[model samples]
Target chain A: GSLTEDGLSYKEKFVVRSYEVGSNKTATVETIANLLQEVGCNHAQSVGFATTTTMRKLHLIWVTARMHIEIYKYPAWGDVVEIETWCQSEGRIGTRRDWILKDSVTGEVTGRATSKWVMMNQDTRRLQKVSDDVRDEYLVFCPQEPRLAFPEENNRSLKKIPKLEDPAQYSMIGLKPRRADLDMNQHVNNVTYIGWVLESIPQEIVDTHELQVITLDYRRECQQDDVVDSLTTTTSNDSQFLHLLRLSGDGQEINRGTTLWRKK
Target chain B: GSLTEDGLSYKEKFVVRSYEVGSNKTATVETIANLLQEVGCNHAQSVGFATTTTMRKLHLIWVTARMHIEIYKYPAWGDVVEIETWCQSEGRIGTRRDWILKDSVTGEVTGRATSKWVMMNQDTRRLQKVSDDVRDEYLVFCPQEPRLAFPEENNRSLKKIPKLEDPAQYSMIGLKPRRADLDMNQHVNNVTYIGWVLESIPQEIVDTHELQVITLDYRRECQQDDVVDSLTTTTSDSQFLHLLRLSGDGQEINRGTTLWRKK
Candidate 1:
């Protein structure tokens, strides 16, 4: 990955591996999310916003608070995908990053994603205000065109995912973390969370439709021992669902999410 | 990956991804297993043995019946590792593939693995003797030194894993398959099976030691709805454990295995 001439965005190309694709012969939403994370981390390295040593000693880490993604099309195995990402500040703590995924050969825009992040003390796990000097260093790469990936000009498609009350239509319990689920940070990787969120989704929707848009609001970090429960409640239509993940024992919410699907 | 000069061996280089590592800051056993499968499939493509087209038309697929892997050390993140693999025929239906992994820079041997495969009709799910024409085409690339990765010349190390009796010491039940677990073949992929096998291992061992050796004998293919029950029984010493995975309903065995651990 290299810095764009604008110096605010970073671009990288990835080959869709055989394992990255699913039965559909195309990359899943999780694969796209994982690639976006890789590029964001690479960008963070270029800006020195979070060097290996700088991040380890400062007791600071970028925690993803919210994300909204829309995949127009999925890439197939062996296809080369190019992604470009840049960042800007939304508010005091709204260090937002946006990405555009393109097909290298066809030069087609395949997907777009926008996410908000906040700083947290790694040891204490408490959300902290972004130190000014830190923001300044990261903002050096702020882009030429600042815009949202999925905007809300009073919009409903990527609107806020509301919290679901009790008595959900579907509930799945006692989900355990495999050793493979942990990333280098010693916690569950974000991509695995999406897998768990769909545990309670009706099997029919899984068979008949494909997830088109997903929004996640992460509330807390999940530890290795935390047994999770996934609960889902449907919206007015069959194409949408409200989802929640919580500690099955303590019932503390971990993440709140919503998913939109379309006929496959 | 490129076809080796010997035409029998295939070589590929893989850089460890940031997410592929664990708390140890190194690749895990599952990562190694997944890479091996990728190279083996690539090799099959070069030989035109069981390719996407050739495999689909004949309803035939290569099934890994048994494997033994020994990891001397795990590669660290961002490290480039080189692997060379080759194949040989063990018996009438025993098609075996072996691999040697090394540190690309230091040229240090990191791991070695060997597995036996049998061709099965993907639709009917029954093992069939490989056609003579198929073996002749694939064996054209067979190497001059056709030795085993882990030898069992009257050897006990790679011996058969005896069946464990009822009332096992450790057992985990009702493990369901996520949609993410399925591969392109519309069935549960092979690597996920290893994750489930270790689910019932005692927490102390998982925390204290690492698995040095794992041998699996896949008896059957597990479907998406199969409710799996993983059971384990330890030997006299804590370093070794015998494991079995069976369907929770009818008790049909899915896999039989053994794991060796050392501090």
Candidate 2:
């Protein structure tokens, strides 16, 4: 129902649930990221580019390399929001996807996101080039250009994510991955890491601040039995927080993220 | 888009996600329970009977007392399923809700569930009668009689849920509630308890056997900070299993359960 003419873009309407909202009654960053992921996968399936059977037979998988989201406004609980996403050609090996979120009633744009994904060989577990067959299946659906321009400066900032040297300098939270965390890949879903990062923030800060920008770089995959430690640091005057997740068993880093927040 | 003429029964389409399915590629019991809860709440809001703001102002809440489910089949990953649910009068103080799940493409019934709910006064933290205004808003939508009857034997079995006394007789698992566990009620959602129980079962049994019947009785509520221990015991020849959930500290019980199956 949400498919577009070229079959390249898709749009869906959703009512924000009470469980998806934060203490401020607005949707959380994690909820938005989840919706983005859902729409992208749904679109791919609708066009016959990828499905569980197809991907498995092809021995191919798509993995998110980097994602940057900007929030102009946050929809509240019970508000109907429209999400529109489309894909565009990035390069030979990677593909670009974009999303625009709008308030269904007001028709006002509330949020936008840009992400990069690369194909991986399931058996080898190594990055692979987008083959001719895979590209032909998807390229026809892509538009000539991206809907929103991802700024170069933001791209630079995403690559400059720093690793905290002193663990004691930041607030930390420990978590064990549950059965609900795993996807078909037998690894933790991408949105679960964002939830863990938010959990590391103090309740007082989460109650008073709203997320404006978020950039995440997933370094390694996490399994169901892995124990993860989320560590975060924020300065008294700065509006940004630095976050990192690592395996508690061997200290292997899982993800590095940076978030910018605004006073509510 | 899936509403029927009665205005009380509502339907919605869903795609089974890989994460929502177990190793058998079928939708898990917890996933169905979550959808049932969502539709019931959505129906109430559509009819002006209840909303988050209204309930908070009235200091009112609805809590699930008992639930029984029968799964004829499980929808696989990527399969679209339609869920339809409605509420009817149970008695003076309680209301009954029913659900039927079907395959969207084939229109084949896959599962059915029946549940009981009661109103609670948030301030008093005690059960309360359905007020006149509240009943008037919802009573018109309910049918004169229930569409399906919940068997009396199942009702008796739900009430007689047993608590395990010996910890050594069961396989146990411990879990700490995460941020995702809490719902709008500020307590861990009921579906989370089912997940914990499934986690406690041995992987061999979970892989080989299919769940046919599940009946859950809520004894107490669990908070975000509380650590929970799920205990399960099953015999080698029998298909039924007994489950119990309790707080790791003080050993206060949270839930009791009974599951029946047929190989």
Candidate 3:
């Protein structure tokens, strides 16, 4: 990966691996999420925007608070995908990163995504604010543009994802984290959360439709200890659904989500 | 990937992805297995040895019957791994494929593995025998010198893996197949079986010892429709265990295996 000439974005090319695709011969949503995450981290490390390893020594880590993705099409195995990502400060305590995914051969857009993140104390897990001394040093490194893939009208308090309650269409309980689910930091990898959410999905939905849009509101990081319960309920619309992931022991929210699906 | 000068083996290079490793910063055993499976399939496609796509059209597919692997060390994340694989006939009904893995920078050997596979009918799911007409055509492509990663005494019986019965130490039941586990061919990918087997293991093992050797004897293929039961029992050896996987309904065997763990 290399930084763009203007130094505003980081770009990389990825070849879709044979294992990355599913039975439909297209990349799964989780695979796309993983790539976007990998590239975003690389961009941060290159620009000195509170990095992956350097900050780890200081007991600091970046955490995702929200993510939204829209897919026009999914890449097939053996296709080369070109992804570019950029970030800008969101507020006194957070930053926003956005991505553009394209087919390297055709130069056609495949998808777009935007995310919100905040720094946290690695040991205590408490949210941290950007110190003025640190903020002044990092702001100069960020690109001047404040672009977004999903534009809003004067930040009208973001989208509201209601809490899922009883009478859910489906529920899967007692989901435990496997050893392989943890990343290098020993935190549960974010992409694995998509699997648990879909575990309770009815067979009919998995067999007939494909995911087009996914929005995740991350409440907290999961560890190896917590047992998960995933619940899903339908909205009045046929193609939309609401999801909630909480601790089975104390009912603490881990994540809340909404998904849009399209017919195959 | 390219065919070696001898045209006897196919070799490729792979970079360990960030997501492929665990908390140890080393590649998982499943990552190693997936790379081996990929190289073997590519070797077959290059040699015209009843290939991945063309054979599928013939209602035929390659199914693994047995696999054995030994790891000397685990590669770290972002390490470039160079792998070479070759194939030779095992018996009238099966073919054996073996691999050698190396660190691209240090030129040191990382591990070795060998697998036995046979042709199966994709629709009927019945074992198929090699016909003389087809055998003569495929034999010309295989390397004549038979090399073995794990050499056996001539004509001796293979290792025995006894079925685990009552009083099993650990058991995890009702494990369902997630859609992500399915591959392009729609069969549950072989690597996933490793996850189910370990799910039943006690947490003590994971927090301490790592997997050093795993040998699987597959009895049947699993589908998305079938519910699975995985059970494990300890052997007399301090670092060895026996495992069993079967259908939850009639208790039919899906796989039997032994794993050697080292601290």
Off by over 4 Å in 3: A44-58, A152-158, A236-238, B44-58, B152-158, B236-238, B246-263
Residue B132 of candidate 3: its Cα lDDT?
56
State the C-alpha lDDT per candidate: 0.78, 0.72, 0.77
Candidate 1 docking band = medium
Give candidate 3's error at residue A133 in angstroms: 3.3
Residues B126-192 of candidate 1 have per-residue lDDT tens digits of: 9988776566656566775656666667543357777777777887776777777888766887888
RMSD of each: 3.0, 3.7, 3.2
Best by DockQ: 1
How do all the candidates rank in terms of lDDT, highest first?
Answer: 1, 3, 2
Reference interface contacts recovered per candidate: 0.57, 0.11, 0.57
**Global local distance difference test of model 2:** 0.72
In model 1, which residue pairs have backbone atoms overlapping below 3 Å?
Answer: A8-A141
Q: Between the candidate structures 2 and 3, which one is better when assessed by TM-score? A: 3
Q: For model 1 chain B, give the 10-residue run with minimal summed lDDT.
A: B237-246
